[PDB]
Amino acid sequence: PPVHPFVAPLSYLLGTWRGQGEGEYPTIPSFRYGEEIRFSHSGKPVIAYTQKTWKLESGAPMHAESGYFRPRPDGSIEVVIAQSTGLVEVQKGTYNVDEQSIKLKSDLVGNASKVKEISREFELVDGKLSYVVRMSTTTNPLQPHLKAILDKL
Amino acid sequence: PPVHPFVAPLSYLLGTWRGQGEGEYPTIPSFRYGEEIRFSHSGKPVIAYTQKTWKLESGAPMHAESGYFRPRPDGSIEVVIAQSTGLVEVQKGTYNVDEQSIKLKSDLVGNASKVKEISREFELVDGKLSYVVRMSTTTNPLQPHLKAILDKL
């Protein structure tokens, strides 16, 4: 169907993507991961999101997640995503067309053992999709947990 | 990869499925919908769920949702799903192998305008997958909203 005028300033996300990431947190040593992401649409004011990660050398599947991005023409946007590990998060924030970036803060991270908030910021950088995921836990303050840069396939 | 021993009693869900549904609630007149569902796996103690609906005669896309089912060998199970409309729900309950059924009650339905709880019960009936979705709103009590029966493709 045709791309909806609500999803148009984010038309740059629609495609398939594959890049590399790194994970770290006070409770767990730094590691590296492979990642794939897909943004697609079916003609509504929502975008589908799908993503999985895997061990680099071996290709061994690790996790996976999928959800929905809901940007509107005043600048605001909400993103819901449920995870393979058993979590769900509601994310709200902004998208900026001139910078091709998105900034999200959580309202909710449910069914999590000790996770409080999640930060998700994304940006297009020379045709590449980067993001950071910062997070708080019961006693560790919000800080970077994941970093990845993806290339459109 | 091989089917994980945690997901094995639900091996009957793995496949593609297409059936018909009906929607109804005090605030909206009864309607009928087309629906497709996919359960698949990548070798962990989680199952991926994907589903979309559409207008029957016309094929016009309507909604879509995706999440994860987490059944364990004591009988319990949790299901997280995020929706195209902007909701997320954490569902917990049981699976029974002899009846090929699953019964889920919500712990949480976030980012919803006036939805309180959701009931999701599924069962295999002569090779068909049926379900009901019952729901409460601020002032209407939990009652059936959706009913569908699907055939494996």
- CATH of residue A8: 2.40.128.20
Q: Are B119 and B131 in contact (CB under 8 A)?
A: no
Shortest CB distance from B44 goes to which of A80, A84, A89? A84
Residue A110, domain extent: 1-153
- Among candidate residues B53, B91, B62, the one with its CA nearest the CA of residue A1: B62
For residue B153, the tally of other CB atoms under 10 A from its CB is 9
> b/e for B94-111, b at 16 or more Cβ within 10 A?
ebeeeebbbbbebebbbb
Q: Are A72 and A93 in contact (CB under 8 A)?
A: no
Q: Is A111 on the interface with B (CB under 8 A)?
A: yes
The Cα of B133 is separated from the nearest Cα of chain A by a number of Å equal to 19
Residues of chain B with C-beta less than 8 angstroms from the C-beta of A43: 61
The Cα of A109 is separated from the nearest Cα of chain B by a number of Å equal to 10
Six token digits for residue B36:
């497709």
- Among candidate residues A6, A90, A117, the one with its CA nearest the CA of residue B82: A90
The Cα of B149 is separated from the nearest Cα of chain A by a number of Å equal to 24
Shortest CB distance from A66 goes to which of B66, B86, B110? B66
Number of domains observed in the structure of chain A: 1
H/E/C letters for each residue in A102-143? EEEEEEEEECCCCEEEEEEEEEEECCEEEEEEEEEECCCCCE
Q: Is B76 on the interface with A (CB under 8 A)?
A: no
Q: Is A77 on the interface with B (CB under 8 A)?
A: no
With a CB cutoff of 8 Å and minimum separation 6, the contacts of B87 are A80, B109, B110, B111, B112, B115
> b/e for A89-121, b at 16 or more Cβ within 10 A?
bbbebebeeeebbbbbebebbbbbeebebbbbb
Residues of chain A with C-beta less than 8 angstroms from the C-beta of B83: 68, 80
Interface contact B66-A43, CB threshold 8 A:
no
Please indicate the experimental technique that yielded this structure: X-ray
DSSP state of B138: S
Interface contact B81-A84, CB threshold 8 A:
no
- Residue in chain A closest to B67 (alpha carbons) equals A82
Q: Is B84 on the interface with A (CB under 8 A)?
A: yes
Q: Is A75 on the interface with B (CB under 8 A)?
A: no
Q: Is B52 on the interface with A (CB under 8 A)?
A: yes
Q: Is A68 on the interface with B (CB under 8 A)?
A: yes
C-alpha–C-alpha distance, residues A47 and A24, integer Å: 29
Which of B39, B88, B106 would you mutate first to test chain A, the one with the most A CBs within 10 A? B88
Handedness of CA B38, B64, B76, A137 (dihedral sign): positive
Q: Is A70 on the interface with B (CB under 8 A)?
A: yes
Q: Label residue B9 left, alpha or beta by phi (over 0 means left) and psi (-120 to 50 means alpha).
A: alpha
- Determine whether the annotation assigns residue A27 to a binding site: yes
- Environment class of residue A152 by beta-carbon count within 10 Å: exposed (0-12), middle (13-18) or buried (19+)? middle
State the Cα angle at B143 between B140 and B144, rounded to 5°. 135
